[PDB]
Amino acid sequence: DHQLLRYLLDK
Amino acid sequence: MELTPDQQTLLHFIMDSYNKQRMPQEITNKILKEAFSAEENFLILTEMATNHVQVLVEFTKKLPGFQTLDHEDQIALLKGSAVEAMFLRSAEIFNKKLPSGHSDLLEARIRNSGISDEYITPMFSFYKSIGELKMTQEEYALLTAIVILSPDRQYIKDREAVEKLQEPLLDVLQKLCKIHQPENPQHFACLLGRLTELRTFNHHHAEMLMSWRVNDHKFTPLLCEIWDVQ
Ligand SMILES: O=C(NC1CCCCC1)[C@H](C1CCCCC1)n1c(-c2ccc(-n3cccn3)nc2)nc2cc(F)c(F)cc21
Numbered sequence: 001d002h003q004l005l006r007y008l009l010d011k
Numbered sequence: 012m013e014l015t016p017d018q019q020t021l022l023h024f025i026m027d028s029y030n031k032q033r034m035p036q037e038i039t040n041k042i043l044k045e046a047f048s049a050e051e052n053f054l055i056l057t058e059m060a061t062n063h064v065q066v067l068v069e070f071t072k073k074l075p076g077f078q079t080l081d082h083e084d085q086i087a088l089l090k091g092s093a094v095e096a097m098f099l100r101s102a103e104i105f106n107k108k109l110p111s112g113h114s115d116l117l118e119a120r121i122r123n124s125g126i127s128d129e130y131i132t133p134m135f136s137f138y139k140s141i142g143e144l145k146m147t148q149e150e151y152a153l154l155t156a157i158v159i160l161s162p163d164r165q166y167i168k169d170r171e172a173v174e175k176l177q178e179p180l181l182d183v184l185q186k187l188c189k190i191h192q193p194e195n196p197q198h199f200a201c202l203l204g205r206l207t208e209l210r211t212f213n214h215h216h217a218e219m220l221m222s223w224r225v226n227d228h229k230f231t232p233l234l235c236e237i238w239d240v241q
Contacts, residue, residue, distance in 0.1 A: 002086050002236045008068045009085055 014190075018183050021075065022149060025180075028073040029152035032066050033059075035104040042120050043113060049125025049224040056124075056223075061231045063097055071159050076176040084167050091164035093237045094216045095209045096155055098137065103151045106142040127222040130215070137208050144201060147191055153184040154202060158209065 014022065038059065047055065071077055071089060080088070109117065122131055146154070157180050162173035188199040195201075212219075217239040221228055228240070235241045 002090065004233050004236050005068070005086055005089060006082075008065070009072070009082070009089070 012186065012189060014183065014186050018179075018186065021179065022153075022183055022187075024073070024075075025152050025156055026149060028070045029148070029155065031069065032100065033062055035107045038104055039107070039109065039113075039117055043116055046120065046123075050226075052124040053223050053225045053228070057229070057231060057234060060097060061233055063100065064093055064233060064237050067093060067096055067159075070155070074156055074159065074176065075179075077160075080172055080176075081169060084169060084173065087164055087166040088159055088161070088173065090237060091166075091213075092159045092161065094213045095158050095206075098134075098209060098212045099141075099151070099155055099158060102138045102141040103146075105138045106146075125224040126219065127224070129222070130219050133211070137205075137212070140208070141205060144198070144205070145192075146202070147187070149187055150184065150191070150202065153180055153187065154206075156180050157184065158206065 041055070068089060077085065105114075105117070105121075108114075118135070122135075126134070144150075157177060160173055160177040160180065162170040162177060164173070167173060184202065185199045188202065189196075192198040220230075220238065220240055230238065230240050
C-alpha cells in the first residue's frame with residue numbers, strides 16, 4: 001500500500 | 012539522422028524538467044567542505060534521496076503519455092526505477108568536472124562515508140564506466156526517462172503501453188549519440204549496456220542501506236515505500 005507514492009502521483 | 016522539430020521539442024521539454032533537480036555543485040560543496048561521521052552521512056543520504064524521489068515523481072509526471080497509463084502501472088514504474096535513477100544521478104554528479112584534486116577528495120569522502128566495503132567497489136566501478144561515456148546533460152536526461160519507462164518492470168499489466176512511451180525517447184537518444192559522438196558508432200549500444208549494470212544496484216539496495224556503519228537505520232515514510240526497508 002504505497003499511499004504516499006499514490007498521493008504524489010494523483011496530487 | 013538529424014532530430015525533427017517534434018524531437019527537438021520533446022528534448023527541450025525533458026531537459027527543462029530534468030534541470031529542476033538539486034544542483035550537483037550544492038551536493039559536492041557539502042561533501043567537500045568538511046568530513047562527517049558515518050551517522051551524519053547516513054542522515055545526509057536519506058534527506059538527499061527523499062528530495063530526489065520527490066523531484067523524480069514530478070519529472071515522471073511530465074514524461075509524455077505517463078498520465079495516460081493505468082494508475083497501478085504508474086506506481087510500478089516509479090517504484091521499479093527510483094533506486095536506479097538515484098544511482099544514475101549520483102554517477103552524473105560524480106563525473107562533473109571539479110578543480111584539481113577535488114574529485115580525488117570527493118571519492119575519498121564517499122569511500123569513508125559509512126557504506127560497507129563490499130559495495131564501494133561496484134559503486135565506483137559503475138561511476139567510472141559512466142564517466143568513460145562522456146555523456147551530455149541531454150543524454151543523462153533521456154537515459155533517466157528511458158530507465159523510468161522500462162516496460163520490462165515487474166508487476167506491469169500493460170507493457171505495450173509503456174513500450175509506446177519509451178520508443179520515441181530511445182530514438183531521440185540514438186540520434187544524439189550519433190551527433191555527439193560520430194567517431195564512436197557503438198556509443199548508443201554502450202549507453203543501453205550501462206542500464207543492465209544499473210539494475211544490479213536495485214537488487215542489493217536494501218542490504219547496502221542496512222550495512223551502513225551506524226547503530227540505527229532511520230528512514231522517512233516516503234523512503235520506506237520506495238526502498239525495501241523498515
Ligand atoms: O548524497 C548522495 N547521493 C545523492 C542521492 C540522491 C540523488 C543525488 C545524489 C551520496 C552521498 C551521501 C553522503 C555521504 C557521501 C555520499 N552519494 C552517493 C551514494 C552513496 C551511497 C548510496 N547508497 C544507496 C544505498 C546505500 N548506499 N547512494 C548514493 N554517490 C555519490 C556521488 C556523488 F558524486 C555525490 F556528490 C554524492 C554521492
